[PDB]
Design a protein around this ligand. Structure first.
Ligand SMILES: O=C1CC(I)=CC=N1
Length: 165
């Protein structure tokens, strides 16, 4: 299963790792994508996960959007995990850089509760513009299922562990 994770709470674990590399090594049941409402996997975690699937995630996502329309901010959808996981839970955290409401971060993390165990990034962190310390606090206070957080940035990882209440 997952290795080298630091236990934060009863159910939240954290590691300084590239989520693509974590997914290829573990091949978890669920890998969470930091998605936008259009499932346009351009940059950040989404661009990286999609590129690891040789664009298969984008092809599948475009078919999903053609059929169903866009997701809601705070919403999610379950798609194939391709070569990374059994499934990919595409979760839309609020993008602060696009003026979206940070209050929706709790709704976004609520999606994780429908899955027993997940490999995930910190929602709304990185290019989404929210404070990662706040995202980790919402995560531990919202997610009740087992979440293995992969934090790409080492300096951020250290700051998150050292400041965790
Ligand atoms: O290139 C990337 C970005 C991020 I954020 C996580 C993993 N790979």
């Amino acid at each position: 299963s997952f290795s080298g994770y630091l236990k934060l709470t009863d159910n939240v674990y954290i590691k300084n790792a590239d989520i693509v590399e974590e997914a290829k090594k573990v091949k978890p049941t669920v890998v969470v994508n930091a998605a936008n409402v259009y499932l346009k996997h351009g940059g950040g975690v989404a661009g990286a996960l999609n590129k690891a699937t040789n664009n298969a995630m984008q092809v599948e996502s475009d078919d999903y959007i053609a059929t169903n329309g866009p997701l809601k901010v705070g919403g999610s959808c379950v798609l194939s995990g391709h070569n990374l996981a059994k499934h990919c839970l595409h979760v839309v955290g609020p993008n602060v850089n696009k003026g979206e409401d940070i209050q929706l971060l709790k709704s976004a993390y609520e999606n994780f509760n429908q899955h027993e165990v997940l490999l995930a990034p910190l929602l709304s962190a990185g290019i989404f513009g929210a404070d990662p310390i706040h995202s980790l606090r919402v995560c531990v206070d919202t997610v009740r299922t087992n979440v293995y957080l992969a934090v790409f940035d080492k300096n951020l990882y250290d700051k998150l562990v050292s400041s965790f209440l």
